[PDB]
Amino acid sequence: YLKFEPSKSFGVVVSSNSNLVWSGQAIVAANEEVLVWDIKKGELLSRWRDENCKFRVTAIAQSRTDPDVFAVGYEDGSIRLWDSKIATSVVSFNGHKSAITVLAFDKTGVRLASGSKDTDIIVWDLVAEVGQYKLRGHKDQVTGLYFIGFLLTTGKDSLIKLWDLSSRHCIETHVAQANGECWALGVSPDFTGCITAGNDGEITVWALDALSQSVNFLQNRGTLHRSSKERAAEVVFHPLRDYFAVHGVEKSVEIWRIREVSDVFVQHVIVRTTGKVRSVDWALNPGVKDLQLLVGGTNNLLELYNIVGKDYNKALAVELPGHRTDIRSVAISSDDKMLASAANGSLKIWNIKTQQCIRTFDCGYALCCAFLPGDKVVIVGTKEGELQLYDVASASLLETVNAHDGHAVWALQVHPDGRSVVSGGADKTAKFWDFLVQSRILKVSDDILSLRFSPDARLLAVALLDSTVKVFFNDTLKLYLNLYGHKLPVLSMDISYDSKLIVTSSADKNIRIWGLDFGDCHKALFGHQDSILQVAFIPHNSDGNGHYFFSASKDRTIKYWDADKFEQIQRIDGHHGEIWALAVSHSGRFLVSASHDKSIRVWEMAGERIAEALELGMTDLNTIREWEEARQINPNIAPPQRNPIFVALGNIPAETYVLNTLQKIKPASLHDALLVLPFSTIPSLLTFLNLFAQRELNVPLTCRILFFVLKTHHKQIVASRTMRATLEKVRANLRAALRRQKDEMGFNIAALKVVSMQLRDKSVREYVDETWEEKVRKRAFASLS
Amino acid sequence: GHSHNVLKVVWLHFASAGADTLVKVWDANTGETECTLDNHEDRLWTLAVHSKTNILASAGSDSKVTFWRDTTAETQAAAAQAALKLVEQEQTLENYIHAGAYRDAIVLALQLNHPGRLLNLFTNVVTTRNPDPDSLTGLKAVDDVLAKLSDEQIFQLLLRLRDWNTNARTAPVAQRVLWALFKSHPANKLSSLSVKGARGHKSLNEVLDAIKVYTERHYKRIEELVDESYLVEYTLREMDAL
Amino acid sequence: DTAEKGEVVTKAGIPIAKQEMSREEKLRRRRREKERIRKAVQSSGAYKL
Amino acid sequence: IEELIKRRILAGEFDEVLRRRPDMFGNPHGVRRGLV
RNA sequence: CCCUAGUAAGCGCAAGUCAUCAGCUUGCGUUGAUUACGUCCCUGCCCUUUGUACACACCGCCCGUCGCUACUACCGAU
RNA sequence: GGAGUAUGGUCGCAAGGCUGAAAAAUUGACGGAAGGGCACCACCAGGGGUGGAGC
């Protein structure tokens, strides 16, 4: 019951996620690991890879005033801080809900602003490891952040927001694009200007200067427009010279110069690249007179261009350690030392033990690859209908044969003896090539999606588009049987080492196990959330497990199954794209899995409540009156130092706090709580009622609990002494408040009577005739009995 | 979607006339009706088009010819600049709220016509804790704007004052700013108040009736409270006796 | 039924507008109204690739 | 018996007598006795 | 584990009713208390936060994690 | 002979296996906090069984 573990992972330079950094090293993002290359020699320096995390990394930032510390933002919402000296994560920050997308650092590097796709921007302290605060604007996702203190951000709702940081609320907003979306932000390093790139190819230009009045900081000084009308991915400024680079996700990067805003900014140069660039970045090398623009493409490459300031040359490139588009097939050697990977545009064969590429060929498209025994030559069936043949040791192309006319070779299987190969195509036929010379063909009803042989070369099995499988005999091609019951067409199949089992992977999201004597389905087992691409048995039963098989599907999963006990024994995660191909070793000890990820991998009490609030307010009143006496003596520094509950509730007055704790309780509970209150607690309540009536708020509530206090303690008040003083104060204050409120409402009702009579006088009638029958609210009021 | 024959289809820079005297425009990739046009008499026959801009010339069996021009670009520019001005003045409202400039905050809230913040500004200005003694609502500047309100702003403020006067919790702040309103403006203006939005339940008679009857209820409550509040003078008289 | 077009009235009888209402209060008002409501043949390339 | 209970609960049909209104005769519409 | 007034408990007499019950069942009279009869503090159970009526009077937008729907733009293979 | 109601036969349809045991939703799923009501399956005050020996 031996499981599988990730041991190796390779075949990848920069992913389609954003944010390349330069340091003469290029620090880019592979899927979950952030890896740093030399650009001069193609050997990577290091990889930063964490065992606790699996989510993909999508934002990189270099700290200023201290390189060899970096901030990476992942897909789950976490941030890690790495070191380039030692490849560990010193601190981790789990603050956001989803998908960190833009990082930013302070000038001093003690403060870190991270804006997500869940639209929160959270700023982080780097000496206390506490989430400082959470700035909250922005209808949808934030696409630009910068530290000006002050913060300047821009979001996908086309708003630039200028936030303060001493008082954590926004000072300014402006709307960059009227009906579009502001997509990128670029700040001048001296904070004089900011240009924001919008959806139409329009670049808006803003000038920056360096509360009760009209505050005006950002000014739309003009609009610019670039050449290509795409959603612009980034705007990067030169840290030293007067240039910037604007690019969308396309094959052009437009470098403009800093000398109307159209007179201020002119395009210096337009750089064409061989692939769609995802993120450009700037590089200045010590001792050169140039501009080292480092582009990182979506098509799996880094390019360092030299731009002459006062044309482009493809100066440096990193393409050897990765396939450039997308791996469609893998086929690993009989000696299991090297493997071949077949991608659209290329063949690249690799060593397992060193995980470094050895040979490279160019083909048009590469559906299916498999080498011939002796591992000297390889076979590739392409989309255009042909079968190409290459060889490893001399690294060349031997032969090419138009197998089918324009119909893609969907299946290639080498004979287990090793003298023939079979190509099943997108035409109806499936052809046999003996070595290569065409020996026998097989015409069948529909397009053959996948065919495989038997390990003892006895029976063949094609798998059509008609959602069916035809198992034939190998010697003469007579129909042995056919397997049915698939709702959607069969994508793959693999049959057992003794030919007593077939697994059959379909597009209806399940795999079937057939017995291959009588072809009875053993058990249809629904095991993947999407259409299962491929299946493979481990070939050797030397280890006692030959009836186990792997299945790889579009839901980013491999699954290790047991066909004897019909049970999933392991679930293999770790791929971030739809896994297209996989293969197992001939020893079966490891397997390779090649994805849409472009990364091929190798696997081995109410009254007591108001009473305590009364006491809190009483201590607050004593502290405030002592602070009044101190500030009356001298204007020296005197802190009141009130309760942390008050400075956490927000420096409210004790009157407001005790009013809220009297307001929260329902009126019957208020009656019972004031009844349960003792006469030691009564005088504090009477002082706070004096405070309410003085600073009038909830006068009916104040009078209600005051008359309840007097009526439930009338004898004790008229026997005590200090109640005379505080009750005289509350009498004067309450009588003034009641007389003020009553006189205001009396003036209101008298004025409403006067204006109502005047409006009646306006309304009465104009004409006079014989019929004064022209000169009332009515309600309905149903009642059941 | 038509009700008679169509008889003419013209390309834009599509439009179709009818024989049901309506000429309607829509677009092809969407496929649903964009606009309809209803100038003519009985019939409609033919449509001409300006070849440079989008101007439609519709004529029929009736003798009138109507010339229409597109305004969609103009109203889109107007809606764009309106949203620009709206987000700018909404942020300056939030700025005045944060700064505590209650005067220009109240002016901008009355301009922006949304009252959930206007009520909070009024509760603040009637409880500022340091009121000017001669001022009506505590602040002389808010007194100045309540004196210098226009007729439509007075009527809209009254239409909010009846809703604040319904709630007995915001009844004191509604009564105080209503007191400031009545002390600022004379009775003849508030009686001859004529605003285009006076129809049905929101006309001036029913608005002043609602305000008056809820103020009658609040006044009855405060009168009962004063009469019950003479108990404190009775208790102080007993302690004076002792 | 007697409110304005842009505004809503709360349970307190106070007009608050949908424009000035924040996202959190919009979500909470949606949750309270929902709580009251609760109380009451293709191609081979498209298959393979 | 347990499977019978599960079938009735799932495709829920219960034989409890239901609370009927006491004035179904004179007030069959069930109007509300307040503002109309 | 059960129990709050002719209840707990004692006592005998009679019957043997189409199921049950003589190793007992069910009636019937007699004698007849102590202590609670409050509170949701503990353990729980039910329910409010929608409706079901109108005056007085009182209250005053309960909170979270997701789904579903509509629209908007993004990502990358075919 | 008409109209019904039954009883038992007879016939026709039902009675042809891409197959091989273990959703709905603008109305839905789950909670929390506050406040009520009730309970010798709760608190409080007492009483009484069973549990020790034998049938």
JSON list of C-alpha atoms in Angstrom, two decimals, chain A residues 465-562:
[
{"chain": "A", "resi": 465, "resn": "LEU", "atom": "CA", "xyz": [-15.59, 8.61, -31.30]},
{"chain": "A", "resi": 466, "resn": "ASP", "atom": "CA", "xyz": [-18.84, 6.60, -31.26]},
{"chain": "A", "resi": 467, "resn": "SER", "atom": "CA", "xyz": [-18.40, 6.29, -27.43]},
{"chain": "A", "resi": 468, "resn": "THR", "atom": "CA", "xyz": [-17.37, 2.65, -27.89]},
{"chain": "A", "resi": 469, "resn": "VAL", "atom": "CA", "xyz": [-14.31, 0.41, -27.71]},
{"chain": "A", "resi": 470, "resn": "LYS", "atom": "CA", "xyz": [-13.47, -2.31, -30.22]},
{"chain": "A", "resi": 471, "resn": "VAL", "atom": "CA", "xyz": [-11.14, -5.05, -29.00]},
{"chain": "A", "resi": 472, "resn": "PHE", "atom": "CA", "xyz": [-9.64, -6.98, -31.93]},
{"chain": "A", "resi": 473, "resn": "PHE", "atom": "CA", "xyz": [-7.20, -9.83, -32.33]},
{"chain": "A", "resi": 474, "resn": "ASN", "atom": "CA", "xyz": [-3.65, -8.86, -33.22]},
{"chain": "A", "resi": 475, "resn": "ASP", "atom": "CA", "xyz": [-2.79, -11.53, -35.79]},
{"chain": "A", "resi": 476, "resn": "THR", "atom": "CA", "xyz": [-5.88, -11.26, -37.98]},
{"chain": "A", "resi": 477, "resn": "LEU", "atom": "CA", "xyz": [-7.99, -8.18, -37.36]},
{"chain": "A", "resi": 478, "resn": "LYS", "atom": "CA", "xyz": [-11.27, -9.87, -36.50]},
{"chain": "A", "resi": 479, "resn": "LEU", "atom": "CA", "xyz": [-13.61, -8.33, -33.94]},
{"chain": "A", "resi": 480, "resn": "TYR", "atom": "CA", "xyz": [-13.00, -10.15, -30.67]},
{"chain": "A", "resi": 481, "resn": "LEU", "atom": "CA", "xyz": [-15.56, -8.06, -28.82]},
{"chain": "A", "resi": 482, "resn": "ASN", "atom": "CA", "xyz": [-16.74, -4.51, -28.29]},
{"chain": "A", "resi": 483, "resn": "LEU", "atom": "CA", "xyz": [-17.27, -2.61, -25.05]},
{"chain": "A", "resi": 484, "resn": "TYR", "atom": "CA", "xyz": [-20.22, -0.24, -24.72]},
{"chain": "A", "resi": 485, "resn": "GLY", "atom": "CA", "xyz": [-21.92, 1.77, -22.01]},
{"chain": "A", "resi": 486, "resn": "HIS", "atom": "CA", "xyz": [-19.99, 5.03, -22.28]},
{"chain": "A", "resi": 487, "resn": "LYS", "atom": "CA", "xyz": [-22.17, 8.12, -22.50]},
{"chain": "A", "resi": 488, "resn": "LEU", "atom": "CA", "xyz": [-19.36, 10.23, -23.98]},
{"chain": "A", "resi": 489, "resn": "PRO", "atom": "CA", "xyz": [-16.41, 9.20, -26.22]},
{"chain": "A", "resi": 490, "resn": "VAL", "atom": "CA", "xyz": [-13.49, 7.29, -24.77]},
{"chain": "A", "resi": 491, "resn": "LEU", "atom": "CA", "xyz": [-10.40, 9.39, -24.29]},
{"chain": "A", "resi": 492, "resn": "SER", "atom": "CA", "xyz": [-7.98, 6.71, -23.12]},
{"chain": "A", "resi": 493, "resn": "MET", "atom": "CA", "xyz": [-7.43, 3.12, -22.06]},
{"chain": "A", "resi": 494, "resn": "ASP", "atom": "CA", "xyz": [-4.82, 0.90, -20.46]},
{"chain": "A", "resi": 495, "resn": "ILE", "atom": "CA", "xyz": [-4.89, -2.86, -20.17]},
{"chain": "A", "resi": 496, "resn": "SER", "atom": "CA", "xyz": [-3.23, -5.06, -17.59]},
{"chain": "A", "resi": 497, "resn": "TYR", "atom": "CA", "xyz": [0.11, -6.87, -17.77]},
{"chain": "A", "resi": 498, "resn": "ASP", "atom": "CA", "xyz": [-1.49, -10.31, -18.07]},
{"chain": "A", "resi": 499, "resn": "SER", "atom": "CA", "xyz": [-4.36, -8.97, -20.25]},
{"chain": "A", "resi": 500, "resn": "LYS", "atom": "CA", "xyz": [-7.09, -9.80, -17.75]},
{"chain": "A", "resi": 501, "resn": "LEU", "atom": "CA", "xyz": [-8.23, -6.19, -17.18]},
{"chain": "A", "resi": 502, "resn": "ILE", "atom": "CA", "xyz": [-8.96, -3.05, -19.20]},
{"chain": "A", "resi": 503, "resn": "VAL", "atom": "CA", "xyz": [-9.53, 0.38, -17.74]},
{"chain": "A", "resi": 504, "resn": "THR", "atom": "CA", "xyz": [-11.28, 2.79, -20.06]},
{"chain": "A", "resi": 505, "resn": "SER", "atom": "CA", "xyz": [-11.33, 6.51, -19.37]},
{"chain": "A", "resi": 506, "resn": "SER", "atom": "CA", "xyz": [-14.14, 8.50, -20.91]},
{"chain": "A", "resi": 507, "resn": "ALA", "atom": "CA", "xyz": [-15.31, 12.08, -21.25]},
{"chain": "A", "resi": 508, "resn": "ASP", "atom": "CA", "xyz": [-18.44, 11.34, -19.20]},
{"chain": "A", "resi": 509, "resn": "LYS", "atom": "CA", "xyz": [-16.26, 11.72, -16.06]},
{"chain": "A", "resi": 510, "resn": "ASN", "atom": "CA", "xyz": [-15.83, 8.03, -15.23]},
{"chain": "A", "resi": 511, "resn": "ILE", "atom": "CA", "xyz": [-13.54, 5.06, -15.87]},
{"chain": "A", "resi": 512, "resn": "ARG", "atom": "CA", "xyz": [-14.63, 1.49, -16.52]},
{"chain": "A", "resi": 513, "resn": "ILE", "atom": "CA", "xyz": [-12.94, -1.79, -15.64]},
{"chain": "A", "resi": 514, "resn": "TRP", "atom": "CA", "xyz": [-13.54, -4.69, -18.03]},
{"chain": "A", "resi": 515, "resn": "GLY", "atom": "CA", "xyz": [-12.48, -8.28, -17.55]},
{"chain": "A", "resi": 516, "resn": "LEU", "atom": "CA", "xyz": [-11.31, -9.05, -21.13]},
{"chain": "A", "resi": 517, "resn": "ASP", "atom": "CA", "xyz": [-12.70, -12.53, -20.96]},
{"chain": "A", "resi": 518, "resn": "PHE", "atom": "CA", "xyz": [-16.36, -11.93, -22.02]},
{"chain": "A", "resi": 519, "resn": "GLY", "atom": "CA", "xyz": [-15.74, -8.17, -21.53]},
{"chain": "A", "resi": 520, "resn": "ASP", "atom": "CA", "xyz": [-18.02, -7.75, -18.52]},
{"chain": "A", "resi": 521, "resn": "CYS", "atom": "CA", "xyz": [-17.73, -4.44, -16.70]},
{"chain": "A", "resi": 522, "resn": "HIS", "atom": "CA", "xyz": [-16.30, -5.22, -13.29]},
{"chain": "A", "resi": 523, "resn": "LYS", "atom": "CA", "xyz": [-17.34, -1.89, -11.77]},
{"chain": "A", "resi": 524, "resn": "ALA", "atom": "CA", "xyz": [-18.09, 1.49, -13.31]},
{"chain": "A", "resi": 525, "resn": "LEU", "atom": "CA", "xyz": [-16.56, 3.91, -10.83]},
{"chain": "A", "resi": 526, "resn": "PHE", "atom": "CA", "xyz": [-17.27, 7.64, -10.99]},
{"chain": "A", "resi": 527, "resn": "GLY", "atom": "CA", "xyz": [-14.14, 9.19, -9.60]},
{"chain": "A", "resi": 528, "resn": "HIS", "atom": "CA", "xyz": [-13.34, 12.59, -11.10]},
{"chain": "A", "resi": 529, "resn": "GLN", "atom": "CA", "xyz": [-15.10, 15.94, -11.26]},
{"chain": "A", "resi": 530, "resn": "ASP", "atom": "CA", "xyz": [-14.20, 16.43, -14.92]},
{"chain": "A", "resi": 531, "resn": "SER", "atom": "CA", "xyz": [-13.52, 14.47, -18.09]},
{"chain": "A", "resi": 532, "resn": "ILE", "atom": "CA", "xyz": [-10.78, 11.97, -17.32]},
{"chain": "A", "resi": 533, "resn": "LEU", "atom": "CA", "xyz": [-7.98, 12.34, -19.85]},
{"chain": "A", "resi": 534, "resn": "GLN", "atom": "CA", "xyz": [-5.68, 9.38, -19.36]},
{"chain": "A", "resi": 535, "resn": "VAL", "atom": "CA", "xyz": [-5.10, 6.12, -17.50]},
{"chain": "A", "resi": 536, "resn": "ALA", "atom": "CA", "xyz": [-2.06, 3.90, -17.01]},
{"chain": "A", "resi": 537, "resn": "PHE", "atom": "CA", "xyz": [-1.26, 0.62, -15.27]},
{"chain": "A", "resi": 538, "resn": "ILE", "atom": "CA", "xyz": [2.03, -0.03, -13.56]},
{"chain": "A", "resi": 539, "resn": "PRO", "atom": "CA", "xyz": [3.54, -2.77, -15.75]},
{"chain": "A", "resi": 540, "resn": "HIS", "atom": "CA", "xyz": [5.59, -4.84, -13.30]},
{"chain": "A", "resi": 541, "resn": "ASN", "atom": "CA", "xyz": [3.93, -7.19, -10.85]},
{"chain": "A", "resi": 542, "resn": "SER", "atom": "CA", "xyz": [7.39, -7.83, -9.41]},
{"chain": "A", "resi": 543, "resn": "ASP", "atom": "CA", "xyz": [6.41, -5.65, -6.45]},
{"chain": "A", "resi": 544, "resn": "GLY", "atom": "CA", "xyz": [3.05, -7.35, -5.90]},
{"chain": "A", "resi": 545, "resn": "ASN", "atom": "CA", "xyz": [0.82, -4.51, -7.12]},
{"chain": "A", "resi": 546, "resn": "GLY", "atom": "CA", "xyz": [0.36, -4.95, -10.87]},
{"chain": "A", "resi": 547, "resn": "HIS", "atom": "CA", "xyz": [-3.42, -4.45, -10.83]},
{"chain": "A", "resi": 548, "resn": "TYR", "atom": "CA", "xyz": [-3.17, -0.81, -9.72]},
{"chain": "A", "resi": 549, "resn": "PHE", "atom": "CA", "xyz": [-3.62, 2.08, -12.13]},
{"chain": "A", "resi": 550, "resn": "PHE", "atom": "CA", "xyz": [-3.41, 5.87, -12.28]},
{"chain": "A", "resi": 551, "resn": "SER", "atom": "CA", "xyz": [-5.99, 8.19, -13.81]},
{"chain": "A", "resi": 552, "resn": "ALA", "atom": "CA", "xyz": [-5.46, 11.84, -14.67]},
{"chain": "A", "resi": 553, "resn": "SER", "atom": "CA", "xyz": [-8.31, 14.25, -15.32]},
{"chain": "A", "resi": 554, "resn": "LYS", "atom": "CA", "xyz": [-9.21, 17.84, -16.23]},
{"chain": "A", "resi": 555, "resn": "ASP", "atom": "CA", "xyz": [-9.96, 18.62, -12.55]},
{"chain": "A", "resi": 556, "resn": "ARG", "atom": "CA", "xyz": [-6.21, 18.88, -11.79]},
{"chain": "A", "resi": 557, "resn": "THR", "atom": "CA", "xyz": [-6.04, 15.47, -10.12]},
{"chain": "A", "resi": 558, "resn": "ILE", "atom": "CA", "xyz": [-4.33, 12.14, -10.51]},
{"chain": "A", "resi": 559, "resn": "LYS", "atom": "CA", "xyz": [-5.89, 9.21, -8.69]},
{"chain": "A", "resi": 560, "resn": "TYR", "atom": "CA", "xyz": [-4.18, 5.95, -7.75]},
{"chain": "A", "resi": 561, "resn": "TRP", "atom": "CA", "xyz": [-6.70, 3.11, -7.95]},
{"chain": "A", "resi": 562, "resn": "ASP", "atom": "CA", "xyz": [-6.73, -0.59, -7.11]}
]
